[PDB]
Automatic annotation (TrEMBL), chains C, F:
Summary of subunit composition and partner proteins: Homotrimer of disulfide-linked HA1-HA2. Interacts with human CACNA1C.
Source organism per UniProt: Influenza A virus
Task performed by this protein: Binds to sialic acid-containing receptors on the cell surface, bringing about the attachment of the virus particle to the cell. This attachment induces virion internalization of about two third of the virus particles through clathrin-dependent endocytosis and about one third through a clathrin- and caveolin-independent pathway. Plays a major role in the determination of host range restriction and virulence. Class I viral fusion protein. Binds to sialic acid-containing receptors on the cell surface, bringing about the attachment of the virus particle to the cell. This attachment induces virion internalization either through clathrin-dependent endocytosis or through clathrin- and caveolin-independent pathway. Plays a major role in the determination of host range restriction and virulence. Class I viral fusion protein. Responsible for penetration of the virus into the cell cytoplasm by mediating the fusion of the membrane of the endocytosed virus particle with the endosomal membrane.
Source lineage: Viruses, Riboviria, Orthornavirae, Negarnaviricota, Polyploviricotina
Record's comment on post-translational modification: In natural infection, inactive HA is matured into HA1 and HA2 outside the cell by one or more trypsin-like, arginine-specific endoprotease secreted by the bronchial epithelial cells. One identified protease that may be involved in this process is secreted in lungs by club cells. Palmitoylated.
Protein name: Hemagglutinin
Cell compartments where the protein resides: Host apical cell membrane; Virion membrane
TrEMBL record, chains D, E:
Coiled coil stretches, renumbered: none
Protein name in UniProt: Hemagglutinin
Description of how the protein assembles with itself and partners: Homotrimer of disulfide-linked HA1-HA2. Interacts with human CACNA1C.
Entire-sequence positions represented here: 345 to 518 of 566
Mod. after translation: In natural infection, inactive HA is matured into HA1 and HA2 outside the cell by one or more trypsin-like, arginine-specific endoprotease secreted by the bronchial epithelial cells. One identified protease that may be involved in this process is secreted in lungs by club cells.
Family (UniProt): Belongs to the influenza viruses hemagglutinin family.
């Protein structure tokens, strides 16, 4: 099997700019390399075959190059329709036909400060004996953000899960939810629970917090 | 135009069997080789199987060998994929891909046309969700705009659909993608932002649907401790 | 077991643009060729059999 | 082509095969790729090398000074000298031009013949255990692993070893 | 070989066949032995004989004395004479060497072609009434006595006469 | 009746060691060959057109 590595996983650049994608192969695949585009909710579409030849209907703004083990894809003028996920696939030694893990092209916009809201678990969840503390970061850019949980002003790790929405089509920002999962036994032992958010849009980290009462 | 139509997908238990059908129109079916490519939910692509234009040659991914079987009926313009001994890891969207070239074996392996695909889910067990509110209390009273939502917890398998106010309120709402917990059950949260001068003018209801468990729970969100 | 697997017989090609002439056809591009016609000189008068000329 | 293989039923050449003049493309469960039939290539390279050396080395000249000098009352022998130089020029030019024209045609036919014999050697080996699907390609009625593939290239393909399995698969395919 | 028969799918020659250049080995209930296809041999012998005579007899020279004598004050014309003798020597030597090289190759290809056509004439006659078992040999699906053997060599093999018996034996053998 | 009986197509060979040269290959042993190059003389001066020379 020919392992295909496709770095960077995510690339940020503005509309109308130029984006360069990289595809690397564990073994030489000559020029038998293809590139595919997949817009959300749609099937994959062939762009490049032979590592340099554009398929039928591919506009000239898409450029492909490379041979051997290093390959690349270029979009000269980046328009909003092309903010999708791109995959590279070799057809030089198969089966198996192998793809790369893909690269997501995100639209670059101005830094947006998140709106932070903290939710202690609803009283009905303590009926079943599990506590879920939800911290929300709403409509921020860039996606890269630091969220830390503080239990009695003590750093927490290995007890929370994050979820990020897809890039908004109307404001081009992201929303993040960090849920802290802890059994009701552990929850009923501590007093202060806080959510610390560090983001490029904040001069200093913001902290929302609550108490067991109120 | 060339059209590729997938069908036969659905829910099934591990160890079960399903059969897919790719409806082919728009090209000489005999001249081109066909493939199946699958994509796990929110994941990358993975080639599954290949059959030549003649049908004598078939190739399969290592993980599906001995379980999957590709076939074609050229006279009927049909491509099939028979899956036996199904596994939970086989849960994915399955596309049928036409080869871009004809009569050049050394230049095969390129897919120019893809169907929209069909969904195969192989779970094991059905667990319904527990819907919990995320109230906009005094610690969520920003003054200008407040935030509330619902916590859909401990359900399996996906999907779960969430709407707000009988589907009327669709703006500033973010329904997060599910997360798989340590318990092996999914969990998501859906939130919306609304002005603070609406906590009492308009009640808020999140509509949760979990068709595998026939869950249609509706939950109220409002502040407390007042 | 299942049938399948393919073997193909083919011949070489390259990016060469060398053209030759044949009895039936002219300007046939070929992959490799050699020149039998010397058409270059060093532009100098030199020593035959090691012995310099009388100038 | 004189033998029908090159630019014939094998339509084009392979830039992907770089190590030889005539070879194979294979595809089985273990993968695919190009390989060159070393025996046929080396035989053809030896043959063409001998051909080029024969054309070059059979011309063995001695030391000679072509020039001649005649005074103004020696015009007739001067013209006789010119006729000799011109006649040799005409003979060598015409012969050289036709030799390259004729032997270039023979060389391309030689490559065409070598490809046809290579295809026919395989076809006579596989017989009904594979199908002739055109363009110089054989599609097997039985699985042919890397070892089996090398046996075909080595001219040691064991037809009876796979004949029963191919027969069953062929009849099933044709049914 | 250019046609693939000699030193090809027919690997070697027969010292046992002594009366002809191309022929047959047969074996039936009446015995075995070598025989030569007289028509193909005589045609090839006529062809090669014409080729050798053409190479020899097209050279028709007249009476001529090559030698010339010049005194010590005739060095220039002496060298002119030498250039003529040398130029003719170079032209004839090179042409003779290449003519033998090129026509020898054509002659061996001619024999290769004659063998292939002889094999193909039989194969097109027998069709499925016999099996192609390699090395230029046909194994019959029906008994072929001496009279039947001569019909194949004479190009008068009656395929429908034996087709039913061969078909029944072929299907039984393959079953 | 039973099947069987065989017919084979082949070509001549002998104990000849004559070697010829070809454009593609050197020293190819062949069954028969002829010499186009006269390389023998009688070692004598003789009469051209029947008339003896003047010695």
């Amino acid at each position: 099997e020919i392992v295909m590595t496709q770095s960077p996983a995510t690339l940020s650049v503005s509309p109308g700019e130029r984006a360069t994608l990289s595809c690397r192969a564990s073994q030489s695949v000559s020029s038998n390399l293809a590139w595919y585009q997949q817009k959300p909710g749609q099937a994959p579409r062939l762009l490049i075959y032979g590592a340099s030849t554009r398929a039928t209907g591919i506009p000239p703004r898409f450029s492909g190059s490379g041979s051997g083990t290093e390959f690349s894809l270029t979009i000269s003028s980046l328009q909003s329709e092309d903010f999708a996920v791109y995959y590279c696939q070799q057809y030089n030694n198969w089966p198996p036909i192998t793809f790369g893990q893909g690269t997501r092209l995100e639209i670059k916009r101005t830094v947006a400060a998140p709106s932070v809201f903290i939710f202690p678990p609803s009283d009905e969840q303590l009926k079943s004996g599990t506590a879920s503390v939800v911290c929300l970061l709403n409509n921020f850019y860039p996606r890269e953000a630091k969220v830390q949980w503080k239990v009695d002003n003590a750093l927490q790790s290995g007890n929370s899960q994050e979820s990020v929405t897809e890039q908004d089509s109307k404001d081009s920002t992201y929303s993040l939810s960090s849920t802290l999962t802890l059994s009701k036994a552990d929850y009923e032992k501590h007093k202060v629970y806080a959510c610390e958010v560090t983001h490029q849009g904040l001069s200093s980290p913001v902290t929302k917090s609550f108490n067991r009462g109120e | 135009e060339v059209q590729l139509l997938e069908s036969g997908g659905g829910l099934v238990q591990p160890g079960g069997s399903l059969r897919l059908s790719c409806a082919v129109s728009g090209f000489t079916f005999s001249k081109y080789a066909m493939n199946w490519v699958r994509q796990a939910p929110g994941k990358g692509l993975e080639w599954v199987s290949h059959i030549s234009g003649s049908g004598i040659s078939t190739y399969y991914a290592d993980s599906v060998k001995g379980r999957f079987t590709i076939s074609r009926d050229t006279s009927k313009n049909m491509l099939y994929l028979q899956m036996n001994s199904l596994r939970a890891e086989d849960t994915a969207i399955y596309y049928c891909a036409k080869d871009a070239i004809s009569g050049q074996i050394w230049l095969q392996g390129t897919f120019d046309y893809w169907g929209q695909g069909t969904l195969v889910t192989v779970f094991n067990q059905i667990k319904g969700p527990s819907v919990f509110p995320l109230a906009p209390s005094s610690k969520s009273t920003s003054g200008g705009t407040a935030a509330l939502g619902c916590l859909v917890k401990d359900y399996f398998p996906e999907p779960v659909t969430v709407s707000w106010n009988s589907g009327a309120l669709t703006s500033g709402v973010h329904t997060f993608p599910a997360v798989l917990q340590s318990s092996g059950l999914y969990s998501l949260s859906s939130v919306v932002t609304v002005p603070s001068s609406s906590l009492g003018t308009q009640t808020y209801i999140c509509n949760v649907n979990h068709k595998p468990s026939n869950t249609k729970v509706d939950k109220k969100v409002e502040p407390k401790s007042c | 077991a299942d049938p399948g697997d393919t073997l193909c017989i083919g011949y070489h090609a390259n990016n060469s643009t060398d053209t030759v002439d044949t009895v039936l056809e002219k300007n046939v591009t070929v992959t490799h060729s050699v020149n039998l016609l010397e058409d270059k000189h060093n532009g100098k008068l030199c020593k035959l059999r090691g012995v310099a000329p009388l100038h | 082509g004189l033998f029908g293989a090159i630019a014939g039923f094998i339509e084009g050449g392979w830039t992907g095969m770089v190590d030889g003049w005539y070879g194979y493309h294979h595809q089985n469960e273990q993968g695919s790729g190009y390989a060159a039939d070393l025996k046929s290539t080396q035989n053809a390279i030896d043959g063409i090398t001998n051909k080029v050396n024969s054309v070059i080395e059979k011309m063995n000249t001695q030391f000679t000074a072509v020039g001649k000098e005649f005074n103004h009352l020696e015009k007739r022998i001067e013209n006789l000298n010119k006729k000799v130089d011109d006649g040799f020029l005409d003979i060598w030019t015409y012969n050289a031009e036709l030799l390259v024209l004729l032997e270039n045609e023979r060389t391309l036919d030689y490559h065409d013949s070598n490809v046809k014999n290579l295809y026919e050697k395989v076809r006579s080996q596989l017989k009904n255990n594979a199908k002739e699907i055109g363009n110089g390609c054989f599609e097997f009625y039985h699985k042919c692993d890397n070892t089996c593939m090398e046996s075909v290239k080595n001219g040691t393909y064991d037809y009876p070893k796979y004949s029963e399995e191919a027969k069953l698969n062929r009849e099933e395919i044709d049914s």
